[PDB]
Amino acid sequence: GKAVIAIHGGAGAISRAQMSLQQELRYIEALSAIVETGQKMLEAGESALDVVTEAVRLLEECPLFNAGIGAVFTRDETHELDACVMDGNTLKAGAVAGVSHLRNPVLAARLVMEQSPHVMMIGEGAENFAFARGMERVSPEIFSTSLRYEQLLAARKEGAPLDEKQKMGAVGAVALDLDGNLAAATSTGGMTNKLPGRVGDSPLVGAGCYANNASVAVSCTGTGEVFIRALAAYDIAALMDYGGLSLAEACERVVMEKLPALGGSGGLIAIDHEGNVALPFNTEGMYRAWGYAGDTPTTGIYREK
């Protein structure tokens, strides 16, 4: 009965020649474990929303990906995290941007959705709201990793299978559940050497995250400014819904044509209401995985064959 999940962990240029297989396998194992968790939840009748929330939570926890633990550093050597989640069944959405004292932004985004009349909260206000609902306050030092610090130092001067450049790491999940509900979630640490207070596409409904039962669930990763300006995630939905494009056609138009034409780089993952799955990326590679409920998953980092 067509339940399916896809996940991503960022996009970038291929650096396989500098990697050992054992290094690559750490990424593959991470992606495999999370997608398999998602598939299991789906086959057991869990909701798309719960599935994308848990998958993004696990991706935040994984230090290899730019969200939560493993977040990139800002120019001030701090971390500012953003996340979004959307329920295609109700069209409700929750989002946080600019948070430093919450371990799992996607769970905070979810709290904004389910435990407030709002869609988006920012900064200390967002944190205070979450703390008032019992979410633990953490120090942002928990997110810090030497790989991302190395990259900050290289960035301000004049280690992974993919080179994200400064902006193209982020994480996300999309799912269609056994009830026909679509959901999407996205989380990020932003961009290496970011001007504090800058916001990219990840937490913005219709830019980095979108879900609607009648069309598509989408999560993006890439150079944020272009994905905002082109409403990348909603554009997929609109092309299909109004233009009558297939998911594949819509993905080609956005990722391979429109975004590049505006100078945007990255990719996205998408599931449509008929259970078609697509993981387009205009970069050389993208950390990714997907699988139908009850089938064996597929993972990838580099080019498709």
Q: Which of 126, 170, 174, 175 binds its own copies (CB under 8 A)?
A: 126
Q: Which of 70, 161, 172, 297 binds Na ion (CB under 5 A)?
A: 70
Distance of alpha carbon 288 from alpha carbon 112, whole angstroms: 27
* C-beta of residue 107 within 8 angstroms of C-beta of residue 131: no
Token readout for 198 is: 């800058």
* C-beta of residue 266 within 8 angstroms of C-beta of residue 250: no
The listed partner (Cl ion, its own copies, Na ion, none) that binds 232, CB under 5 to 8 Å by sort, is none
Verify binding: residue 305, Cl ion, rule CB under 5 A.
no
Q: What is the 3-state secondary structure (H, E, C) of 123-185?
A: HHHHHHHHHHCCCCCCCHHHHCCHHHHHHHHHHHCCCCCEECCCCCCCEEEEEECCCCCEEEE
The listed partner (Cl ion, Na ion, its own copies, none) that binds 69, CB under 5 to 8 Å by sort, is Na ion
Distance of alpha carbon 117 from alpha carbon 140, whole angstroms: 27
Verify binding: residue 278, Na ion, rule CB under 5 A.
no
Verify binding: residue 207, Na ion, rule CB under 5 A.
no
Task: Give the range of 30-38, 91-99, 275-283, 290-298 binding its own copies by CB under 8 A.
Answer: 91-99
Q: Which of 9, 224, 264, 300 binds Na ion (CB under 5 A)?
A: 224
**Backbone φ/ψ region at 17: left (φ over 0), alpha (ψ -120 to 50), beta:** alpha
Verify binding: residue 1, its own copies, rule CB under 8 A.
no
Verify binding: residue 161, Na ion, rule CB under 5 A.
no
| DSSP run (H or E) holding 247 | helix 247-251
CB of 45 to Cl ion, least distance (A): 26
Verify binding: residue 206, its own copies, rule CB under 8 A.
yes
Verify binding: residue 65, Na ion, rule CB under 5 A.
yes
Q: Which is nearer to its own copies, 10 or 98 (CB)?
A: 98
Distance of alpha carbon 73 from alpha carbon 136, whole angstroms: 22
Three-state secondary structure call for residue 222: strand
Verify binding: residue 252, its own copies, rule CB under 8 A.
no
Q: Which residues bind Na ion (CB under 5 A)?
A: 60, 62, 65, 67-70, 113, 116, 118, 157, 167, 170, 200, 214, 224, 281
